[PDB]
UniProtKB/Swiss-Prot annotation, chains A, B:
<comment type="subunit">
    <text>3CL-PRO exists as monomer and homodimer. Only the homodimer shows catalytic activity. Interacts with host FBXO22; this interaction promotes the proteasomal degradation of nsp5.</text>
</comment>
<feature type="topological domain" description="Cytoplasmic">
    <location>
        <begin position="1"/>
        <end position="305"/>
    </location>
</feature>
<feature type="cross-link" description="Glycyl lysine isopeptide (Lys-Gly) (interchain with G-Cter in ubiquitin)">
    <location>
        <position position="5"/>
    </location>
</feature>
<feature type="cross-link" description="Glycyl lysine isopeptide (Lys-Gly) (interchain with G-Cter in ubiquitin)">
    <location>
        <position position="90"/>
    </location>
</feature>
<feature type="active site" description="Nucleophile; for 3CL-PRO activity">
    <location>
        <position position="145"/>
    </location>
</feature>
<protein>
    <recommendedName>
        <fullName>3C-like proteinase nsp5</fullName>
    </recommendedName>
</protein>
<feature type="active site" description="For 3CL-PRO activity">
    <location>
        <position position="41"/>
    </location>
</feature>
<feature type="domain" description="Peptidase C30">
    <location>
        <begin position="1"/>
        <end position="305"/>
    </location>
</feature>
<comment type="function">
    <text>Cleaves the C-terminus of replicase polyprotein at 11 sites. Recognizes substrates containing the core sequence [ILMVF]-Q-|-[SGACN]. Cleaves and inactivates human TRMT1, preventing tRNA guanine(26)-dimethylation of tRNAs. May cleave human NLRP1 in lung epithelial cells, thereby activating the NLRP1 inflammasome pathway. May cleave human GSDMD, triggering alternative GSDME-mediated epithelial cell death upon activation of the NLRP1 inflammasome, which may enhance the release interleukins 1B, 6, 16 and 18. Also able to bind an ADP-ribose-1''-phosphate (ADRP).</text>
</comment>
């Protein structure tokens, strides 16, 4: 028993992290087979970031200008190309630690693990969610760019995020491994404000199921609701609308606990309207939304990799 | 910027996890050099756990009764011994992935990463603290015993915890890697109640410094206090007494922010007396105590391994 914010084991990803230096800029790259992926802004000075023309800046770069180091050992760059907002540095050596992997583009509400790195060296691992406004709330210092987000299914690493940008409000923006930003964000030091950070309702419900499974029960009430009634309350409290698809996804947790999804929605409705009254659920004083239904099933069942 | 509950990268520990089976009991072992460490209760049936005599149960076990599997590959057991509440299974093969390591016994308030494992396979990593009552609040299902807690200093893994027991209240007890339980707990299925789970004051203060560094500032006030005045409030709210040693440990964070430790104590005093008033600090609605001053410096400075 017990329920923790839990990251995937990071070893398979640690074996892929390298340092990429272009001129005075050092950040992280992801070495898979004979390609190193990194943010294209490695080619920019702080000055360049105000209004960069990446194709023009890239003309002044040769293979030998991209310094790629895997631990103490230099990798030879035999080609480079830009794909959207990432560079692909072709190296003459396949990463011998390349795991089974996929590139996936995740939906808002999906969770993933981040391996925060500096100078190609892993510093820590934490679990976070693609927010509905396509930001993430990470922990990223200067030099963390090129750190990646991922999920693991048994032995296959699904890479879903590469870190590029901190907004002036201290939230984070980045790309998939095809170099396409999540949301409207761009790799330029400019006015970019995030939209409403709404709460991921289906994840809050999953976490309330996790609470019941782990013996936190006080918030269960005598009420039910409908999707339409619940969504009137969701809208007021800046929660994502709950759809029949979300209800279907929560089916297994409903089955496990015998608590109908709409009954749990009624519990959530009362928590939104009445607050916590100084009580906690799984050690939180707020409704946690960075566990997916799949995360709750996985953690509550002990799935391994 | 941003501040996350962050675990150490788990790769060095993943390379040490094995499955240990004795009769019908399977759990995890830690393979370092030519020794596998596991909970001695691997030799017990569920029935045995009510009142086990471990020396007597162990007489009926031979080397060949301890099935040790590293991935798909069986390890040959050439000796076994009991040290306190752990077994040391001597194997004929040194773990080729053995990292630099130490065994440390941590103090209450210290944090560490747990690599939750099942059948010798890592499931996830999370960060937790030795509670003042010598429990931990983990995420442990049946089969997770032998999962370990650790810290990393650059390339050296300090192993501090091995998981043994869940108390009837769903909190967790275990040993150091010398097999000595933290606190008064025993490896028997018996009446064991935890003492007061007090709040780790020095860690709450460290986290309030982390909040200021990351721009969460609303709780700073015009007040100061003394250790003795603060401790009158700490005692009322089941916080650990703050000592001059804690004040000294917070010195670097005080220096970094220009906020005197006793001024931050006055901010904490007001938060305890007035509550949060529906506000959050670093995305929490409660005062977080599972970051040490060293964790806050490490995360805020980007230290790597």
């Amino acid at each position: 028993s017990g329920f923790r914010k839990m990251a995937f084991p990071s070893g398979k990803v640690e074996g892929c992290m390298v340092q990429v230096t272009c001129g005075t800029t050092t950040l992280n790259g992801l070495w898979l087979d004979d390609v190193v992926y990194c943010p294209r802004h490695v080619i920019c000075t702080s000055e360049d970031m105000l209004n960069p023309n990446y194709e023009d800046l890239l003309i002044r770069k040769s293979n030998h200008n991209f310094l790629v180091q895997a631990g103490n050992v230099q990798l030879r760059v035999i080609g480079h190309s830009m794909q959207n907002c990432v560079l692909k540095l072709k190296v003459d050596t396949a990463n011998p630690k390349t795991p089974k992997y996929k590139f996936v583009r995740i939906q808002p509400g999906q969770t993933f693990s981040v391996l925060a790195c500096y100078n190609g060296s892993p510093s820590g691992v934490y679990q976070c969610a693609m927010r509905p406004n396509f930001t993430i709330k990470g922990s990223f210092l200067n030099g963390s760019c090129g750190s990646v987000g991922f999920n693991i299914d048994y032995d296959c690493v699904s890479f879903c995020y590469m870190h590029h940008m901190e907004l002036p409000t201290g939230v984070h923006a980045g790309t998939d491994l095809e170099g396409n930003f999540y949301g409207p964000f761009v790799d330029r030091q400019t006015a970019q404000a995030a939209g409403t950070d709404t709460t991921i309702t289906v994840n809050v419900l999953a976490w309330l199921y996790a609470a019941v499974i782990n013996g936190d029960r006080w918030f269960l009430n005598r009420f039910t609701t409908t999707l339409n009634d619940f969504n009137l309350v969701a809208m007021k409290y800046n929660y994502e609308p709950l759809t029949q698809d979300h209800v279907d996804i929560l089916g297994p947790l409903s089955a496990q606990t015998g608590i109908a999804v709409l009954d749990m929605c009624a519990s959530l409705k009362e928590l939104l309207q009445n607050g916590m009254n100084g009580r906690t659920i799984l050690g939180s004083a707020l409704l946690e939304d960075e566990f997916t239904p799949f995360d709750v099933v996985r953690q509550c069942s002990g799935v391994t990799f």
